[PDB]
Design an enzyme around this catalytic site. Structure first.
Site, PDB file in Angstrom:
ATOM      1  N   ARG A 172       1.936  -3.417  -1.401  1.00 34.78           N
ATOM      2  CA  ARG A 172       3.294  -3.145  -0.947  1.00 34.78           C
ATOM      3  C   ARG A 172       4.073  -2.417  -2.035  1.00 34.78           C
ATOM      4  O   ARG A 172       3.959  -2.735  -3.222  1.00 34.78           O
ATOM      5  CB  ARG A 172       4.016  -4.444  -0.585  1.00 34.78           C
ATOM      6  CG  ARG A 172       3.596  -5.088   0.719  1.00 34.78           C
ATOM      7  CD  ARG A 172       4.446  -6.329   1.012  1.00 34.78           C
ATOM      8  NE  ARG A 172       4.227  -7.387   0.025  1.00 34.78           N
ATOM      9  CZ  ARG A 172       5.014  -7.626  -1.017  1.00 34.78           C
ATOM     10  NH1 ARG A 172       6.106  -6.913  -1.237  1.00 34.78           N
ATOM     11  NH2 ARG A 172       4.694  -8.602  -1.863  1.00 34.78           N
TER      12      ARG A 172
ATOM     13  N   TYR B  44      -2.032   0.645   3.607  1.00 30.19           N
ATOM     14  CA  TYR B  44      -2.458  -0.601   2.983  1.00 30.19           C
ATOM     15  C   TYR B  44      -1.607  -1.781   3.432  1.00 30.19           C
ATOM     16  O   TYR B  44      -0.373  -1.712   3.403  1.00 30.19           O
ATOM     17  CB  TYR B  44      -2.395  -0.512   1.458  1.00 30.19           C
ATOM     18  CG  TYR B  44      -3.176  -1.630   0.804  1.00 30.19           C
ATOM     19  CD1 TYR B  44      -2.619  -2.897   0.632  1.00 30.19           C
ATOM     20  CD2 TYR B  44      -4.477  -1.419   0.375  1.00 30.19           C
ATOM     21  CE1 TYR B  44      -3.346  -3.922   0.047  1.00 30.19           C
ATOM     22  CE2 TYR B  44      -5.210  -2.420  -0.207  1.00 30.19           C
ATOM     23  CZ  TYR B  44      -4.644  -3.672  -0.372  1.00 30.19           C
ATOM     24  OH  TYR B  44      -5.387  -4.667  -0.959  1.00 30.19           O
ATOM     25  N   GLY B  45      -2.280  -2.873   3.797  1.00 31.73           N
ATOM     26  CA  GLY B  45      -1.702  -4.203   3.884  1.00 31.73           C
ATOM     27  C   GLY B  45      -0.310  -4.304   4.472  1.00 31.73           C
ATOM     28  O   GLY B  45      -0.065  -3.851   5.590  1.00 31.73           O
TER      29      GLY B  45
ATOM     30  N   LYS C 199       4.642  -8.580   7.575  1.00 29.78           N
ATOM     31  CA  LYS C 199       5.876  -8.681   6.804  1.00 29.78           C
ATOM     32  C   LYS C 199       7.050  -7.985   7.487  1.00 29.78           C
ATOM     33  O   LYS C 199       8.106  -8.597   7.676  1.00 29.78           O
ATOM     34  CB  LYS C 199       5.664  -8.107   5.400  1.00 29.78           C
ATOM     35  CG  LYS C 199       4.527  -8.761   4.616  1.00 29.78           C
ATOM     36  CD  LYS C 199       4.740 -10.264   4.464  1.00 29.78           C
ATOM     37  CE  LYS C 199       3.747 -10.861   3.467  1.00 29.78           C
ATOM     38  NZ  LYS C 199       3.977 -12.309   3.236  1.00 29.78           N
TER      39      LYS C 199
ATOM     40  N   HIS D 282       8.766 -17.433   4.787  1.00 31.70           N
ATOM     41  CA  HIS D 282       7.543 -17.124   4.056  1.00 31.70           C
ATOM     42  C   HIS D 282       6.876 -18.438   3.645  1.00 31.70           C
ATOM     43  O   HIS D 282       6.836 -18.820   2.475  1.00 31.70           O
ATOM     44  CB  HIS D 282       7.875 -16.251   2.856  1.00 31.70           C
ATOM     45  CG  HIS D 282       6.681 -15.653   2.186  1.00 31.70           C
ATOM     46  ND1 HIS D 282       6.710 -15.216   0.880  1.00 31.70           N
ATOM     47  CD2 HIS D 282       5.431 -15.405   2.640  1.00 31.70           C
ATOM     48  CE1 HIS D 282       5.524 -14.728   0.555  1.00 31.70           C
ATOM     49  NE2 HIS D 282       4.731 -14.830   1.606  1.00 31.70           N
TER      50      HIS D 282
ATOM     51  N   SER E 160       4.272 -15.381  -5.336  1.00 33.31           N
ATOM     52  CA  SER E 160       2.959 -14.789  -5.557  1.00 33.31           C
ATOM     53  C   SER E 160       2.262 -15.457  -6.737  1.00 33.31           C
ATOM     54  O   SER E 160       2.887 -15.767  -7.755  1.00 33.31           O
ATOM     55  CB  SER E 160       3.090 -13.286  -5.800  1.00 33.31           C
ATOM     56  OG  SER E 160       3.977 -13.027  -6.872  1.00 33.31           O
ATOM     57  N   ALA E 161       0.955 -15.691  -6.581  1.00 32.64           N
ATOM     58  CA  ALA E 161       0.136 -16.369  -7.586  1.00 32.64           C
ATOM     59  C   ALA E 161       0.663 -17.776  -7.872  1.00 32.64           C
ATOM     60  O   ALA E 161       0.858 -18.172  -9.024  1.00 32.64           O
ATOM     61  CB  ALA E 161       0.039 -15.541  -8.870  1.00 32.64           C
ATOM     62  N   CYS E 162       0.896 -18.534  -6.800  1.00 34.21           N
ATOM     63  CA  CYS E 162       1.294 -19.936  -6.917  1.00 34.21           C
ATOM     64  C   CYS E 162       0.554 -20.867  -5.964  1.00 34.21           C
ATOM     65  O   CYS E 162       0.570 -22.083  -6.194  1.00 34.21           O
ATOM     66  CB  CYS E 162       2.806 -20.083  -6.696  1.00 34.21           C
ATOM     67  SG  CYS E 162       3.507 -21.670  -7.206  1.00 34.21           S
TER      68      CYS E 162
ATOM     69  N   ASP F 216       0.941 -18.305   5.752  1.00 37.51           N
ATOM     70  CA  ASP F 216       1.830 -17.277   5.216  1.00 37.51           C
ATOM     71  C   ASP F 216       3.210 -17.227   5.870  1.00 37.51           C
ATOM     72  O   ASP F 216       4.221 -17.151   5.161  1.00 37.51           O
ATOM     73  CB  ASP F 216       1.159 -15.905   5.330  1.00 37.51           C
ATOM     74  CG  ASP F 216       1.908 -14.824   4.565  1.00 37.51           C
ATOM     75  OD1 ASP F 216       2.274 -15.064   3.401  1.00 37.51           O
ATOM     76  OD2 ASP F 216       2.124 -13.725   5.115  1.00 37.51           O
TER      77      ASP F 216
ATOM     78  N   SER G  62      -6.708  -7.209  -4.044  1.00 29.58           N
ATOM     79  CA  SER G  62      -7.765  -7.116  -3.048  1.00 29.58           C
ATOM     80  C   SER G  62      -7.660  -8.265  -2.047  1.00 29.58           C
ATOM     81  O   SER G  62      -7.144  -9.348  -2.348  1.00 29.58           O
ATOM     82  CB  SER G  62      -9.136  -7.124  -3.717  1.00 29.58           C
ATOM     83  OG  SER G  62      -9.322  -8.303  -4.474  1.00 29.58           O
ATOM     84  N   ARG G  63      -8.188  -8.020  -0.845  1.00 27.31           N
ATOM     85  CA  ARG G  63      -7.874  -8.820   0.326  1.00 27.31           C
ATOM     86  C   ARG G  63      -9.123  -9.156   1.125  1.00 27.31           C
ATOM     87  O   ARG G  63     -10.118  -8.430   1.096  1.00 27.31           O
ATOM     88  CB  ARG G  63      -6.887  -8.073   1.237  1.00 27.31           C
ATOM     89  CG  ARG G  63      -5.563  -7.761   0.573  1.00 27.31           C
ATOM     90  CD  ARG G  63      -4.685  -8.983   0.584  1.00 27.31           C
ATOM     91  NE  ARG G  63      -3.466  -8.798  -0.185  1.00 27.31           N
ATOM     92  CZ  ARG G  63      -2.325  -9.411   0.088  1.00 27.31           C
ATOM     93  NH1 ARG G  63      -2.216 -10.240   1.115  1.00 27.31           N
ATOM     94  NH2 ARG G  63      -1.270  -9.192  -0.691  1.00 27.31           N
TER      95      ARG G  63
ATOM     96  N   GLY H 219      -7.233 -29.615  -5.331  1.00 31.83           N
ATOM     97  CA  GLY H 219      -7.304 -30.775  -4.458  1.00 31.83           C
ATOM     98  C   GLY H 219      -6.458 -31.941  -4.925  1.00 31.83           C
ATOM     99  O   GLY H 219      -6.031 -32.768  -4.114  1.00 31.83           O
TER     100      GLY H 219
HETATM  101 MN   LIG Z   1       2.801 -13.667   1.929  1.00 34.16          MN
END
Ligand SMILES: [Mn+2]
Length: 605
Positions: A77, A216-217, A225, A245, A267-269, A294, A394-395, A514
């Site tokens: 994005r 892309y995405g 989104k 979100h 992001s990244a959490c 998501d 990457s996805r 976990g």
């Molecule tokens: Mn998202």
């Protein structure tokens, strides 16, 4: 006209006229209506293989799966090119890029004029939410990218069934997308067409979405989104519901009592990890199931409960970091029937991404790969050039039904009643492992001020996705809670979580993954009124003895290291909240100021 190739099952005159206007503008060579059939999906996949956009993966390692690698300029994005073109700039707000709508239309008209010359326009009908349901909304995306068509098939309810719901007069969200790479006669196409010039534009009043230049995405899969968050949040503001979100999960305890929570993580959490959480040792009889990973659409009901549905039909997840340790349900999900974008290719025709070595004997890296740019990759090359085998963004794209932990109500149009909201974030200091807000307003304050590591604020994890002014969005949440409580209802609990407090050696103290089940189980106890906790300056947090440590060697001092409150740290934190509020001063709700003043009062008591 005949040049639309309109199928007989399309009975909606307004829709046909709109498609005709966009065909007149975009001038594709041919128009193709996607019926959503499995055979059509395979045909389009084969077209992508024939063009070189897709490589078919080895059918023994990864059945019916494909690898696509994108142009290095088109990998994520592009927030600087994303616009909320409301009539008034104040309704875009400080977290959005604004342009006068008539100026943006004049900017985009020459770009879209003939953008599809030499290409096929794919008409992609889709429902966000279960088909025909009272809470779903229909979109139509016109695109010249078969990559968009095949991914939309997986991510949404796509194709012919949409038109039985639309009928002759039903409304739809109009979406137009082009890679912005018109082809001349006899011109050889590239494997990933795109344009350096990019626009992702939203006209909220008309619900229009226009996307130019990226294939892309989140730039090009417009249901995810642009529709399900940006446009949808505007509709929710006007119609009394929420487009968030958030993952949605079900958690069932050994007595069969089932709770649902919605959780926003920056992001990244860890939204995909948490939404597919596997209960660790000590939680026999518990189960965690995935409604969505998501997007949540949440509407209050007459019975005083907030009902959430997942408007998507699949997962479009970040690949790197996924392995059988962090997320076995996700790993099992992508065993087959998956489209991978910008991951690495192994010597046996399988895929690889950073983090998968955690499953290998000795955690050893592969000796050789082809990276997402088509280059030879080895651990030594990675050391010398710094290149990652898989792009960080990457996805994988995969149907929700591939998830072994998919909740039975994942496509139930009635939705699931939300018992708690969770707002995560990555903070090395300051924020406790878990805190329960004392009130709805204080929970909104927590969501409004959440941040991730410097520390970047991302209110409600909606900073790149708010369809209108962020402060009015805060007010929507406050008003929605007041109206719910006014009907006597019991408002869902709100928690903030932080998996990433650092110990005195700079390492993460909380094992996470976990083991997050132990925090979730405390929330459950609180929801039932049986959980204890310590009241502090920002809310209520569990004591060590309040969690179930069966099956985990984790000490009281470790727990207090990640959970205890420090007044000095929160004095500094409130200064940072003040900076955020100045960036957001317009229409900032007074209740958030009262919450900050109350925290300050407790800090000085
Ligand atoms: Mn998202």
């Amino acid at each position: 006209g005949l040049n639309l190739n309109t199928p007989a099952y399309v009975k909606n005159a307004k829709l046909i006229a709109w498609v005709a206007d966009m065909v007149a503008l975009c001038k594709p060579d041919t128009v193709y209506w996607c019926d959503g059939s499995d055979a059509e999906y395979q045909r389009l996949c084969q077209q992508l293989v024939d063009a070189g956009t897709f490589k078919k993966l080895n059918e023994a390692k990864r059945p019916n799966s494909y690898l696509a690698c994108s142009d290095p300029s088109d990998v994520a994005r592009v927030e600087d090119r994303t616009y909320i073109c409301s009539a008034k700039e104040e309704n875009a707000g400080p977290t959005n890029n604004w342009m006068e709508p008539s100026e943006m239309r004049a900017t985009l008209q020459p770009l879209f004029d003939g953008c599809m010359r030499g290409r096929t326009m794919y008409v992609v009908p889709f429902s966000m939410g279960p088909l025909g349901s009272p809470i779903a909304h229909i979109g139509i995306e016109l695109s010249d990218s078969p990559y968009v068509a095949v991914n939309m098939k997986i991510m949404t309810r796509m194709g012919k069934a949409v038109f039985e719901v639309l009928g002759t007069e039903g409304d739809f969200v109009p979406c137009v997308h082009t890679v912005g790479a018109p082809l001349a006669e006899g011109e050889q196409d590239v494997t990933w067409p795109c344009n350096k010039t990019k626009y992702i534009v939203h006209y909220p009043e008309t619900r229009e979405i226009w996307s130019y230049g990226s294939g892309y995405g989140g730039n090009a899969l417009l249901g995810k989104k642009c529709f399900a968050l940006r446009i949808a949040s505007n509709m929710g503001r006007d119609e009394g519901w929420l487009a968030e979100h958030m993952l949605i999960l079900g958690v069932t305890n050994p007595e069969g009592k089932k709770y649902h929570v919605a959780a926003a993580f920056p992001s990244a959490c860890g939204k995909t990890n948490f939404s597919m959480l596997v209960p660790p040792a000590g939680f026999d009889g518990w189960s965690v199931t995935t409604i969505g990973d998501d997007i949540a659409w949440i509407k209050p009901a007459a019975d005083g409960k907030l009902y959430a549905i997942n408007p998507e039909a699949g997962y479009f997840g970040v690949a790197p970091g996924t392995n059988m340790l962090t997320n076995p349900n996700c790993m099992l999900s992508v065993r087959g029937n998956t489209i991978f974008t910008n991951v690495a290719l192994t010597d046996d025709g399988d895929v690889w991404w950073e983090g998968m070595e955690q499953d290998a004997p000795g955690k050893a890296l592969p000796d050789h790969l082809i990276d997402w740019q088509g280059k030879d990759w080895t651990p030594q090359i990675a050391k010398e050039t710094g290149a990652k085998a898989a792009h960080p963004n990457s996805r994988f794209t995969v149907a929700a039904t591939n998830n072994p932990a998919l909740d039975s109500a994942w496509d139930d149009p009635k939705g699931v009643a939300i018992d708690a909201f969770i707002f995560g974030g990555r903070r090395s200091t300051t924020v406790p492992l878990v805190t329960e807000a004392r009130s709805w307003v204080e929970g909104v304050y927590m969501a409004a001020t959440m941040g991730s590591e410097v520390v970047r604020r991302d209110p409600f994890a909606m900073l790149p996705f708010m369809g209108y002014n962020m402060s009015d969005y805060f007010q929507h949440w406050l008003d929605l809670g007041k109206k719910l409580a006014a009907s006597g209802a019991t408002l869902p609990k709100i928690y903030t979580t932080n998996w990433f407090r650092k110990g005195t050696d700079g390492k993460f103290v909380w094992p996470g993954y976990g083991e997050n089940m132990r925090v979730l189980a405390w929330m459950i106890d609180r929801i039932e009124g049986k959980g204890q906790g310590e009241d502090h300056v920002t809310g209520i947090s569990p004591s060590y003895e309040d969690l179930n440590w069966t099956g985990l060697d984790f000490s009281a001092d470790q727990f207090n290291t990640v959970t205890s409150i420090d007044k000095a740290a929160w004095l500094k934190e409130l200064e940072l909240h003040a900076e955020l509020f100045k960036q957001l001063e317009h229409h900032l709700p007074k209740e958030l100021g009262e919450t900050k003043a109350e925290i300050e009062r407790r800090l000085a008591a």
